[PDB]
Design an enzyme around this catalytic site. Sequence first.
Site, PDB file in Angstrom:
ATOM      1  CG  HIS A  64     -51.470  88.155  87.437  1.00 54.15           C
ATOM      2  ND1 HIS A  64     -51.740  89.501  87.250  1.00 54.15           N
ATOM      3  CD2 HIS A  64     -51.442  87.632  86.173  1.00 54.15           C
ATOM      4  CE1 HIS A  64     -51.888  89.737  85.954  1.00 54.15           C
ATOM      5  NE2 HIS A  64     -51.672  88.633  85.265  1.00 54.15           N
TER       6      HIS A  64
ATOM      7  CD  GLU B  97     -55.467  86.057  97.774  1.00 52.39           C
ATOM      8  OE1 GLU B  97     -56.410  85.870  98.540  1.00 52.39           O
ATOM      9  OE2 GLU B  97     -55.177  87.199  97.359  1.00 52.39           O
TER      10      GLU B  97
ATOM     11  CG  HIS C  25     -37.314  76.923  89.967  1.00 54.20           C
ATOM     12  ND1 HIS C  25     -36.015  77.139  89.533  1.00 54.20           N
ATOM     13  CD2 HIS C  25     -37.279  77.117  91.296  1.00 54.20           C
ATOM     14  CE1 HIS C  25     -35.263  77.484  90.576  1.00 54.20           C
ATOM     15  NE2 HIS C  25     -35.998  77.496  91.697  1.00 54.20           N
TER      16      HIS C  25
ATOM     17  CD  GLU D  77     -36.982  76.056  95.546  1.00 52.84           C
ATOM     18  OE1 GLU D  77     -36.817  76.605  94.439  1.00 52.84           O
ATOM     19  OE2 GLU D  77     -36.221  76.277  96.526  1.00 52.84           O
TER      20      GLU D  77
HETATM   21  C1  LIG Z   1     -54.842  87.842  85.200  1.00 56.19           C
HETATM   22  C2  LIG Z   1     -54.564  86.660  84.269  1.00 56.19           C
HETATM   23  O1  LIG Z   1     -53.302  86.676  83.550  1.00 56.19           O
HETATM   24  C3  LIG Z   1     -54.604  86.751  82.785  1.00 56.19           C
HETATM   25  P1  LIG Z   1     -54.817  88.292  81.852  1.00 56.19           P
HETATM   26  O2  LIG Z   1     -53.454  89.025  81.992  1.00 56.19           O
HETATM   27  O3  LIG Z   1     -55.081  87.805  80.463  1.00 56.19           O
HETATM   28  O4  LIG Z   1     -55.942  89.139  82.446  1.00 56.19           O
HETATM   29  C1  LIG Z   2     -33.380  80.669  94.930  1.00 57.46           C
HETATM   30  C2  LIG Z   2     -33.006  80.367  93.501  1.00 57.46           C
HETATM   31  O1  LIG Z   2     -33.887  79.443  92.779  1.00 57.46           O
HETATM   32  C3  LIG Z   2     -32.453  79.075  93.027  1.00 57.46           C
HETATM   33  P1  LIG Z   2     -32.280  77.594  94.072  1.00 57.46           P
HETATM   34  O2  LIG Z   2     -33.740  77.047  94.258  1.00 57.46           O
HETATM   35  O3  LIG Z   2     -31.422  76.643  93.251  1.00 57.46           O
HETATM   36  O4  LIG Z   2     -31.667  77.938  95.417  1.00 57.46           O
HETATM   37  K   LIG Z   3     -32.472  75.392  98.886  1.00 52.19           K
HETATM   38 MN   LIG Z   4     -51.853  88.462  83.129  1.00 52.32          MN
HETATM   39 MN   LIG Z   5     -35.454  77.950  93.696  1.00 51.73          MN
END
Ligand SMILES: C[C@@H]1O[C@@H]1P(=O)(O)O
Ligand SMILES: C[C@@H]1O[C@@H]1P(=O)(O)O
Ligand SMILES: [K+]
Ligand SMILES: [Mn+2]
Ligand SMILES: [Mn+2]
Lengths: 134, 134
Positions: free
Chosen positions: B7, B41, B64, B110
């Site tokens: 996650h 999700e 990112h 992104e």
């Molecule tokens: C699943 C979500 O990140 C939270 P936890 O790691 O505190 O359960």
């Molecule tokens: C895939 C890797 O994050 C880098 P870009 O978004 O600069 O290509």
């Molecule tokens: K790109």
């Molecule tokens: Mn967690």
């Molecule tokens: Mn990227």
Amino acid sequence: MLTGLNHLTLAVADLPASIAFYRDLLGFRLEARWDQGAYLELGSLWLCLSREPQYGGPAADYTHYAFGIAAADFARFAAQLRAHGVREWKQNRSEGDSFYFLDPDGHRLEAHVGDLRSRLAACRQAPYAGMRFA
Amino acid sequence: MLTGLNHLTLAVADLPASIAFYRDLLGFRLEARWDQGAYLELGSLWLCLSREPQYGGPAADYTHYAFGIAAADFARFAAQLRAHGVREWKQNRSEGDSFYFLDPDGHRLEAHVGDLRSRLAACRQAPYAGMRFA
Ligand SMILES: C[C@@H]1O[C@@H]1P(=O)(O)O
Ligand SMILES: C[C@@H]1O[C@@H]1P(=O)(O)O
Ligand SMILES: [K+]
Ligand SMILES: [Mn+2]
Ligand SMILES: [Mn+2]
Ligand SMILES: C[C@@H]1O[C@@H]1P(=O)(O)O
Ligand SMILES: C[C@@H]1O[C@@H]1P(=O)(O)O
Ligand SMILES: [K+]
């Protein structure tokens, strides 16, 4: 539509140290390395390490990245990293074993046994405050 | 050992605003919400929003999160988010269309066309500085 997570990119101050951590300690496969970054894969996860030598690590907040692990491997993993002097940032309180550890820059990581479905099931049996399911 | 991404958890100062952004603008499915967070999700991605009212957003760095999108859908997505006044944080320079935008807290996002394999294939025909491949 958007299809899922395409990649996770982490700023890293010490690219060599971060490659060693993710590859050698955590078992990511190194797919490419260049003077300013690396690409690694773990299962279907594409991890990019982007070199940023002035980076001081993240803000102190809840943002974190969790990787899956099988129940049978959890205890050995936690012990391995503890024996390797990795720093913890949180003590598990929620469903499913979790080990909450820091990367070389202070990115907040987790190794977790469970998934969204096990979390929602545990939550239905014992809901969080105000919890509503959708 | 580790199996992949389990996650992604993001700190959010305004939980209702972030739920609406990820659900309605980015198309995540809301699975559960409670007073201090939400589970969503997208594909296989388990997103957790953790309410943190004094969070001020991340440090300015390269960290990112990228979500996949099909080539034919890209232009419409970028146009839609621009028309909705989303702020951009980077201009695409690398293989595959990419749109680099901020979430309500300033987490760096992104939308990207391509994957690790297309990146590696493109890099082998035109390698980054110093690039070595497995
Ligand atoms: C699943 C979500 O990140 C939270 P936890 O790691 O505190 O359960
Ligand atoms: C895939 C890797 O994050 C880098 P870009 O978004 O600069 O290509
Ligand atoms: K790109
Ligand atoms: Mn967690
Ligand atoms: Mn990227
Ligand atoms: C992030 C929120 O403080 C809670 P927890 O870690 O007990 O889930
Ligand atoms: C993150 C590093 O500045 C480079 P790029 O955005 O041109 O890949
Ligand atoms: K847990």
